[PDB]
Design a binder for these strands. Structure first.
Lengths: 322, 322
DNA sequence: CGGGTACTCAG
DNA sequence: CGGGTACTCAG
C-alpha cells in the first residue's frame, strides 16, 4: 500500500493514460500571469518523473485519449479551441477553433470543458459551456468540425461515452442528464434527476456500461448520484462532500471522486454504494486517471491559488496503489 | 483669481491655521504599509512649501488648534489617542490614550474622529466613534481626561463648538443632531433632522454662531442641510453631491463643502442658500481650512488609493484665493 | 453564465 | 459598526 505525491508543474488539470505507450500525460496551463500557452507533460507511470514536456501555443486543460489512433486530445478552455497531439511522438498535430467570436460585454464565446473520444469511429466529443451550452462533434481524422449538438443547457460541463451503445451522455447546471444517440447526434431525452427544489450542478459523469450505470457528481450537494442509463432512475445517493471529478473502475467495481474544497478523494464501493475509503489529498484535488489494469489511480492536485495571489509552488500528481 | 495645488505628503487629512504663527499645519498618516507613525507638516500660507516636518510616533488624522495657547491637537485614529503639539516650536507636548482596550472579535476600541478646542476654557472635545459613540472631554492643561459624554449614538463623527454659548453640537449616523451644554457636559437634546425614511449619515457640522445656524453634511444624500441651532428646524436643503467636510466662513457668509467621490468642493452662498460655485478638485478632496481673514481657502486632496493598491503619489493641498 | 471574498478615516 | 468590489477551470 503506497501513495506517491510528486511535483510536476503549475496549473495541473486533466490526465490521460496509454497502455501501448506505458505513460500518463498531464495537461498543465502553467503560470497564469507569467506564462503564455502551456505544457502537456508525459510522465512515467511508476516514478511520475517527467519523461517529456510538450510546449503548446495554447493552454491545455481537459484531456482524453483515443487508444486506437494513439492520439491525445486537449481542450483549450481559454482559447475556445481543441488540440490534437500524437502520443507516440509528442507532436502537435494541429488545432481547431470551436468559437472564434471575440469576448465583449454581450458575448461569451463557448469554452471547451470535457472531452471523450470514440475509438471505434475516431470522433471527439467536446462539451462547450456557457449560458446555453453545446457539444461540438469533431472529426479526429482531419480535426475539422462535423456539427454542434445544440441546446444541452446551462453549464453542460459533464460528458461520458458508451461507444458500443452509441450513447453520449452529458450533465448540466439545470440538474439535467441528457442522453444522445451518437448515430444521428440527436438528443434522445433529458430528465431532471432530483426534484427537491434545491440547486444542483452535475459537473461530471463517468459510466459503467456493463451495468448501464452512470456515476454523477454534484458541486452543490453532499451526495454523488448513481443513475440507471436507461431511465434516469436514481439507483443510489452516496454521502460525500460536494464532488467534482468522478471515475468508474470496471476492474474493481468502484468509483473515485474528487472533493475540491474538502481536499479528499472518495472511494465508492460500486457494489454496496458506500464510501469504503477516503484518501486525504490537499489542497485541491482536481482530476482522475486510471492505469489500464485499474490497479493504479492517479490524482492531479492543485495548490491553493487565488487569481490575484497565485501559487508559487507547482501542482502535484498523486500516484495511488489501489 | 488663483488656485495653487501643491504636493505635501502621503495620507493627508486635516489642517489647522494660526494667525499668530502665520502658518497652516497638515496632518498626514503617511504610507499605510510602509510607514509606522506619521508626520504633521507646517506649511507656508502662501507658497505651501513645507517649512517644518514634525515626526510623530502615532499617525495623526483629525486636527484643530487652540489659538489662545497656540497648541495643536491631533486625533490618532488608529491608536485611539490624542496628541498635543506646541505650534510655536513644533514639539510634541504629550499624548493621552482615549481607549486602551485591545481589538478583538468582540471589541472595537472607540477611535477619535473630530476635535474642537474651546479657547476660553482650554478644553478639547473629541468625538470617539463606534457602534455606540461618545465624546471625550479632555483637559488641554495636563492632557488628562475629564469625562466621557456618553450615548451620542452610532458613528457620531461630527463635532462643532459655540464657545461663548457653551454649546457643543455633534451629528451622527442615526440622522441625529445632538446639542450639549458644555457647562455640565450633559446632552440637552437630540432631534432626527429629516424623516423621509431614507438613510442619513451626518458626517460633519460647521457653525455660524452669529445667526445660530449649523451647516451639516450628508454622506448618504445629495443635499447639505442648514439647521437652526435653537430648535433643529431645517432652514434649507442645498442641492449638492454627497458631502463630507464642511466649513462656514463668517467673513464671506458662505460655506465650503467637500464632495469626496465627486472630486468637487462646493461654495454655498449662506445668504441665498445656493451653490454659487464649484471648485473642481480630484481625486478625493478631504478637509478644509481657512486663513484667519477668511480670504483664503485650503483644501487637502487625497489620491485614489485602495488599501490593497496604495497610491505611489503624495496627496496635495490646494490653496484657493477666494 | 451572475452574485460572495476583505476593506475602514469609508460612511 | 455590518454588507458591496472583481474572480472564472469555479460551480
Amino acid at each position: 500500500e503506497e501513495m506517491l505525491r510528486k511535483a510536476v508543474g503549475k496549473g495541473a488539470y486533466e490526465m490521460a493514460y496509454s497502455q501501448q505507450e506505458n505513460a500518463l500525460w498531464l495537461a498543465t496551463s502553467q503560470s497564469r500571469k507569467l506564462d503564455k500557452g502551456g505544457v502537456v507533460y508525459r510522465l512515467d507511470p511508476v516514478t511520475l518523473e517527467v519523461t517529456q514536456a510538450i510546449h503548446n501555443d495554447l493552454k491545455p486543460f481537459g484531456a482524453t485519449i483515443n487508444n486506437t489512433t494513439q492520439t491525445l486530445w486537449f481542450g483549450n478552455t481559454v482559447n475556445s479551441a481543441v488540440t490534437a497531439i500524437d502520443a507516440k511522438t509528442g507532436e502537435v498535430k494541429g488545432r481547431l477553433v470551436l468559437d472564434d467570436r471575440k469576448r465583449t460585454e454581450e458575448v461569451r464565446p463557448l469554452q471547451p470543458r470535457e472531452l471523450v473520444a470514440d475509438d471505434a469511429t475516431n470522433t471527439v466529443y467536446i462539451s462547450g459551456i456557457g449560458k446555453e451550452s453545446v457539444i461540438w462533434v469533431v472529426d479526429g481524422g482531419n480535426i475539422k468540425l462535423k456539427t454542434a449538438i445544440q441546446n444541452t443547457g446551462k453549464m453542460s460541463t459533464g460528458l461520458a461515452l458508451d461507444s458500443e451503445g452509441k450513447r453520449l451522455y452529458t450533465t448540466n447546471a439545470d440538474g439535467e442528464l441528457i442522453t444522445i444517440d451518437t448515430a444521428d447526434n440527436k438528443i434522445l431525452s433529458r430528465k431532471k434527476l432530483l426534484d427537491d427544489g434545491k440547486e444542483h450542478f452535475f459537473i461530471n459523469i463517468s459510466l459503467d456500461t456493463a451495468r448501464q450505470r452512470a456515476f454523477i457528481t454534484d458541486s452543490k450537494a453532499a451526495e454523488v448520484l448513481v443513475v440507471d442509463t436507461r431511465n434516469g432512475n436514481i439507483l443510489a445517493k452516496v454521502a460525500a462532500p460536494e464532488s467534482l471529478a468522478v471515475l468508474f473502475n470496471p476492474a474493481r467495481n468502484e468509483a473515485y471522486v474528487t472533493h475540491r474544497q474538502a481536499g479528499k478523494v472518495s472511494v465508492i464501493d460500486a457494489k454496496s454504494y458506500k464510501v469504503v475509503k477516503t484518501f486525504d489529498t490537499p489542497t485541491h484535488p482536481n482530476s482522475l486517471a486510471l492505469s489500464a489494469d485499474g490497479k493504479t489511480l492517479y490524482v492531479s492536485v492543485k495548490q491553493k491559488s487565488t487569481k490575484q495571489q497565485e501559487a508559487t509552488q507547482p501542482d502535484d500528481v498523486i500516484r495511488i496503489a489501489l
